[PDB]
């Protein structure tokens, strides 16, 4: 039994989540906790989307552990989703044939492109003369 594993990262505004995926039985954990114990649970389906789209059969041969850092809660969740999807695709590319990777990538991309491609948006700098990047202080005459 060779030691085959892949580490992939996903990003949101400042949040970075790195998923390590190796041969296993189907364990998926984030920071040591199960997927269903991550907060907030309002956006729980956003975290279960890749599994629901691909099924437990494709995840049944791998163990995945995610470490998240930075950003906010929503950004961390969106980073975790992308890290999971990219890690599974990268594992299938290396240790399975190319056809399975193509199928998985097509299924993921059709539903949502951000599962595999990062969002480049970042906060804009403040400029003097106003509260923020675009807004200006109240002008007065007379």
């Amino acid at each position: 039994g060779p030691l085959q594993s892949v580490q992939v990262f996903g990003r949101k505004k400042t949040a970075t989540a790195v998923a390590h995926c190796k041969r296993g039985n189907g364990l998926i954990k984030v920071n040591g906790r199960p997927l269903e114990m991550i907060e907030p649970r309002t956006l729980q389906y956003k975290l279960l989307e890749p599994v629901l789209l691909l099924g437990k059969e494709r995840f049944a041969g791998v163990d995945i552990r995610v470490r998240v850092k930075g950003g906010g809660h929503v950004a961390q969740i969106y980073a975790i989703r992308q890290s999971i999807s990219k890690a599974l695709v990268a594992y299938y590319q290396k240790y399975v044939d190319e056809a399975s990777k193509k199928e998985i990538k097509d299924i993921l991309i059709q539903y949502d492109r951000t599962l595999l491609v990062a969002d480049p948006r970042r906060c804009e700098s403040k400029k003097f003369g106003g509260p923020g990047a675009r807004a200006r202080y109240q002008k007065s005459y007379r």
Binding site: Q93, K94, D97, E98, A99
Partner: protein, 314 residues
């Protein structure tokens, strides 16, 4: 009297197909380099829906991949890129086993020796470097190799004295002697830059081509100009049939086959049915290769496609 008929098409790339490599050991697999920084190993099924599907992607190059060549036993692969480095991959696991560094410009061509113990590489640095398997550049040539870019470098598979042939953008075809690495022969017949040079399996004839559109056949052992065959716009690739005594040239829109005994065209390969797309230029034929079986031509095009042509005997 043979007709070449399009059999199928392979679609796995996102960029221009730049080189196609075959091997006698494994007839069922092909290796194709492309401009998407990826080298695709194709597994041939010869099925109804798909003639072949991609099997494994070799991705370690930051820039375009220019040339790819398989080893004698078909177990390793060699590749040059525009990032200035060469890569030696294990085809079994799809991992880079060796890296060759030392070029300061894009590496345009790379060639394996007949014993898989010598490696040659020509760069846009106007430099020809000779390396071993371990990755050490044994000898670099700055002896006025070319005043311009070096397009292609090839080894001569002949029982006689080993020979390396190169073509330059300075309109010259140079012939160097192996194991001593000295300039042996110069050939000045072209009007324009050169793209490809190839050697017949006998090791006696060589073909040179470029922008001028004329494929010039020279004699290697004796060192004289033999023939000149007119072609299309630009000659991208030149190949010899291992068992049929043919010369296949890859022009932009079409592919030409010449019989060297009669100097007569055997076939021209091109197809397009849509009338609306006639305004746009047809995709160019970039790469060309013969299967060791001798019955299928593999042609890589600008259209991000690889087309297979089957010989039909009449």
């Amino acid at each position: 009297t043979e007709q070449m008929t399009l059999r199928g098409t392979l679609k796995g790339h996102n960029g221009w197909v730049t080189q196609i490599a075959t091997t006698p050991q494994f007839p069922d697999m092909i290796l194709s380099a492309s401009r998407d920084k990826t080298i695709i190993m194709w597994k041939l099924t010869r099925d109804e829906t798909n003639y072949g599907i991609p099997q494994r992607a070799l991705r370690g190059h930051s820039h375009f991949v220019s040339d790819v060549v398989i080893s004698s036993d078909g177990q390793f692969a060699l590749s040059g890129s525009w990032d200035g480095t060469l890569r030696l991959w294990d085809l079994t696991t799809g991992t880079t086993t060796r890296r060759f560094v030392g070029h300061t410009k894009d590496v345009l061509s790379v060639a394996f020796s007949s014993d898989n113990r010598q490696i040659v590489s020509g760069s846009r640095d106007k430099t020809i470097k000779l390396w071993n398997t371990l990755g050490v550049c044994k000898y670099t040539v700055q002896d006025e190799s070319h005043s311009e870019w070096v397009s292609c470098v090839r080894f001569s598979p002949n029982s006689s004295n080993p020979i390396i042939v190169s073509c330059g953008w300075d309109k010259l075809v140079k012939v160097w002697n192996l194991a001593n690495c000295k300039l042996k022969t110069n050939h000045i017949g072209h009007t324009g830059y050169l793209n490809t040079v190839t050697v017949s399996p006998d090791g006696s004839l060589c073909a040179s081509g470029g922008k001028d559109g004329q494929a010039m056949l020279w004699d290697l052992n004796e060192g004289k100009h033999l023939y000149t065959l007119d072609g299309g716009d630009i000659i991208n690739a030149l190949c010899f049939s291992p068992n049929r005594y043919w010369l296949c040239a890859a022009t932009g829109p079409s592919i030409k086959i010449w019989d060297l005994e009669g100097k007569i065209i055997v076939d021209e390969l091109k197809q397009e049915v849509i009338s609306t797309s006639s305004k746009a230029e047809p995709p160019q034929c970039t790469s060309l290769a013969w299967s060791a079986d001798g019955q299928t031509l593999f042609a890589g095009y600008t259209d991000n496609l690889v087309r297979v042509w089957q010989v039909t005997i009449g």
